[PDB]
Design an enzyme around this catalytic site. Sequence first.
Site, short mmCIF file in Angstrom:
data_model
loop_
_atom_site.label_atom_id
_atom_site.label_comp_id
_atom_site.label_asym_id
_atom_site.label_seq_id
_atom_site.Cartn_x
_atom_site.Cartn_y
_atom_site.Cartn_z
CG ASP A 36 40.33 41.74 34.98
OD1 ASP A 36 39.77 42.03 33.89
OD2 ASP A 36 40.41 42.55 35.93
CG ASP A 232 37.77 43.86 30.77
OD1 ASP A 232 38.29 42.89 31.38
OD2 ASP A 232 37.16 44.78 31.37
N1 4RW Z 1 37.91 44.21 33.91
C1 4RW Z 1 37.54 44.64 35.16
N2 4RW Z 1 38.18 44.30 36.24
C2 4RW Z 1 37.74 44.80 37.56
C3 4RW Z 1 38.24 43.78 38.56
C4 4RW Z 1 37.47 42.48 38.45
C5 4RW Z 1 35.98 42.70 38.69
C6 4RW Z 1 35.44 43.69 37.70
C7 4RW Z 1 36.23 44.98 37.77
C8 4RW Z 1 35.67 46.02 36.82
S1 4RW Z 1 36.11 45.68 35.09
#
Ligand code: 4RW
Length: 389
Positions: A36, A232
């Site tokens: 991530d 992302d």
């Molecule tokens: N890039 C992102 N990370 C967090 C943690 C992983 C699941 C999704 C969320 C929202 S967006």
Amino acid sequence: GSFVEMVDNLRGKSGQGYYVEMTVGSPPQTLNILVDTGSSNFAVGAAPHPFLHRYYQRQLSSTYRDLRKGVYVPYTQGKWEGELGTDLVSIPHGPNVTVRANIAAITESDKFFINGSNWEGILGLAYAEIARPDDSLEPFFDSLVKQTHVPNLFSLQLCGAGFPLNQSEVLASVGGSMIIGGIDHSLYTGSLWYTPIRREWYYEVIIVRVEINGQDLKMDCKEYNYDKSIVDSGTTNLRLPKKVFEAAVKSIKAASSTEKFPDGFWLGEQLVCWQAGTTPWNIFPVISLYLMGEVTNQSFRITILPQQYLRPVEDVATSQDDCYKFAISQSSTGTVMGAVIMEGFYVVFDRARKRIGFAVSACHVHDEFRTAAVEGPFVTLDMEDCGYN
Ligand SMILES: NC1=N[C@@H]2CCCC[C@@H]2CS1
């Protein structure tokens, strides 16, 4: 310069995420961890849950250190809470090192672990500024670099299959590569073009122009970066600020207008299906995002195809049809170049030189008539002005 230990170390898909195998604790406990670039905490399931097959057991690790501190992390959809600690961490198909890292032990969650996604934790690869509870919690990659000789750079090749994969096929299939500490030159074609990391919090970049089939969307460039633009891997879609989204969908609709689709398709909720092999890729336009270059007054563009922005999904009737959801959606927190965009490109997160590289991915889905592209340079002026303050 090959990295055979790291090539093909990822599994997954844009809908559920791409994950890497990691070990935590002594003796090592193996877990699947989501890659991530949109967050900065290393957090792992640490208590039983209906959607988790395994989880971190701190009481079984002799090297576990309790930081005696809690952490709460809410997202738009979903959230989790846990308990901070440190332990020894390795990536089996990664560099040959073990480091002591911060780990958030997830003890409660809501809508976070989704049924069938296969990962048991998350690896936040962005910077300390957005770490929870605050920036004193050193992120995993920072620890790795500080404690080893691994260079301060990683690169990602996320491979979209081009068709649906069931949990069984996702388990069996190679989903891409995370190359830690380097660039494997076999994962791309053409040249790498670099854009500056505007600021080290998210991987923030600056978009300076947007085209739909060559036609300029013609917005004030500040609109493209309102209030930031980031790269992302933990977000599925290409996400666009409300005003850009509305204008892009209108242009994509106009270009594709020989066929009409229900509103729910354009809202990203409803699938569209075609008889096997007859997806009319050619009616959908290409999308080019121009990014600020490293040289003064210079930009380059990345170009994706409908094969990137239409995400393959299984049919409700599970037929032989080829079905997709529209993987562009609106945002109120700026542009997000999510997994469906990254599947087009080899993306180099060059932290050492504060820049992000893009090259056409050697695993991108395309047809005999068009491919993804990364092209430049273009003379562009007052690019500094595109950034939001
Ligand atoms: N890039 C992102 N990370 C967090 C943690 C992983 C699941 C999704 C969320 C929202 S967006």
